[PDB]
Amino acid sequence: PSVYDAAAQLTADVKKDLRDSWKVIGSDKKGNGVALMTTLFADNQETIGYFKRLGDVSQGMANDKLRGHSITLMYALQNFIDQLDNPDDLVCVVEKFAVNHITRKISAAEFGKINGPIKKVLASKNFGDKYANAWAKLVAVVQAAL
Amino acid sequence: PSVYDAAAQLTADVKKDLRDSWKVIGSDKKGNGVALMTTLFADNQETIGYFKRLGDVSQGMANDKLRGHSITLMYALQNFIDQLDNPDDLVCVVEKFAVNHITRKISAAEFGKINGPIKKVLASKNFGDKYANAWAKLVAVVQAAL
Ligand code: HEM
Ligand code: HEM
Ligand SMILES: [Xe]
């Protein structure tokens, strides 16, 4: 299937759940972005080496490169959320970020490692399994490009 | 380097002018982002070669990679606007994007070529030299990091 095919999973209900949870998670991009990355590295230690540009990714907010990365990642998510109703626009921004990951040899399966950290960050604001599942559908749009 | 000294130029008055103009420009990220890029390419044709990944940029909005790029650029600007309160956070996201441009061999002087396009896009929405000059101070923070 194509990336457009994958975006068919973003039904009205999935988009509502994405938007509702993002209103909260995206309101603290620094805090929740660094939490997302820290959780990735806590649970998926095999990924740490890919991030060597950032320095020591265990230093949390006392690592300016990690903070800058993490905030910017949250604006990638903001971008996706704002494009949900126009699959043409969603696909072209997904393809852009997919290239950022392809050129670093991140496979679709490796990209999907982010679902565990997303589930945990969601649950930190009491967004449960329905919301984690909705976010996995959005992650899968990127996986379709990888 | 002199990056923190550039960031210190974003006074309360400058920040207000950035926020007030961004309220309008950032309300159409697709349209104004592509306009910024097509204006850069038209007026600074010697920069087009750097963008070869995007294909034929003369196609404008109809070029999916250019559209994806352009939307994403506007979320870099959104990020900067949202960090204006906190010099450490503004600088760490500026440094992130500066690294992206250093990889592409973009100097402070060539990055500064965006000011003419910014002035033109602002003016098209009835934001004149006052606002162009505020945006130039923000551009100068990135220039200081290159
Ligand atoms: C929600 C999921 C994710 C989003 C939206 C995302 C977004 C981003 C963004 C915006 C960048 C910056 C690209 C650049 O400027 O070149 C980035 C860099 C990167 N991403 Fe992700 N990413 C995600 C998940 C992952 C996962 C799960 C991995 C690996 C297992 C990964 C590995 C990388 C690497 C290695 C970099 C480069 C870091 C650096 O050296 O600057 N990403 N990602
Ligand atoms: C307001 C000013 C600008 C902002 C906020 C900005 C932002 C961005 C962003 C967010 C990206 C994607 C980075 C990545 O994923 O690696 C990018 C890419 C790029 N930028 Fe800029 N940029 C600006 C001006 C310029 C100018 C003036 C030049 C050149 C003279 C330039 C040259 C490039 C190049 C060559 C790329 C890579 C395109 C590609 O192959 O994907 N940028 N820029
Ligand atoms: Xe991504």
Ligand SMILES: [Xe]
């Ligand atoms: Xe999220």
Ligand SMILES: [Xe]
């Ligand atoms: Xe995602």
Ligand SMILES: [Xe]
């Ligand atoms: Xe930038």
Ligand SMILES: [Xe]
């Ligand atoms: Xe702008």
Ligand SMILES: [Xe]
């Ligand atoms: Xe900028």
